[PDB]
Design a protein around this ligand. Sequence first.
Ligand SMILES: [Ca+2]
Ligand SMILES: [Ca+2]
Ligand SMILES: [Ca+2]
Ligand SMILES: [Ca+2]
Lengths: 145, 145
Amino acid sequence: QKVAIVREDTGTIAELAEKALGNMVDIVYAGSDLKEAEEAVKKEKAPAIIVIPKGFSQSLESGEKARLEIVWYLRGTGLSEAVSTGTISSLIESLKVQLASFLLNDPKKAQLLFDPLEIVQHTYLRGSLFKNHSPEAIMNVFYSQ
Amino acid sequence: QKVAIVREDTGTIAELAEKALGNMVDIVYAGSDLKEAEEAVKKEKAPAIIVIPKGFSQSLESGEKARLEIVWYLRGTGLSEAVSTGTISSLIESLKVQLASFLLNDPKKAQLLFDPLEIVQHTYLRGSLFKNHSPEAIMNVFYSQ
Ligand SMILES: [Ca+2]
Ligand SMILES: [Ca+2]
Ligand SMILES: [Ca+2]
Ligand SMILES: [Ca+2]
């Protein structure tokens, strides 16, 4: 799967999230500019940008779920898109596992073991932007007729 | 990861779910008896039983989300348990992908592409049973103090 990673957080554990994600995907853009990640994605017809926002590292150091956003670019509602959705979701689960050793430090951090991330999802369908919705949600709406 | 699969549904797509799961785990018991899967799990100190209940195949043929249950056996609230949780979750995502071709048949089935499964989770913590809760939920409760 082709993914852009946009890392806005300069902290070590953020860097580590980026690294973990990037070993599991086909990096199409890796950096701090969301406009440019959007451009690599539209060019590449890649399905998602994963954003590691500013505050990610600090949350985790505070014993707070870190925010991770996925912007999805759906250009169709078929098999390939379903495969990307499921595959990238699977990759986010795996990232949680690849963060765990870093959460062993404080007691503050111990919840985070099982549930370290707060995943926010946005969906482009045919160039319509549905903020704060996952593709499942968007698809369940439309197909609920 | 060590998992028991308990398949109560005799349909083809159920069989296929079992097969997909089983190629990705270390089968500890595979069959239709939940008491016996519970016994292989407690013996093996495995973390989960995945149940494919009766009605799974029919749901999917009807264009309805199929029910999949996970019973988790937590004997601790640490790294290993967090790794199982995240890993098995990742495996459930992957199963969704491995079902997809079978959902290409009807228009009834087209939603299911993105969201084919209704995942019900139960958690044993130290021999206390918390029906209808995931380990994340149980852990977020206790650590919310
Ligand atoms: Ca650095
Ligand atoms: Ca998902
Ligand atoms: Ca058969
Ligand atoms: Ca989970």
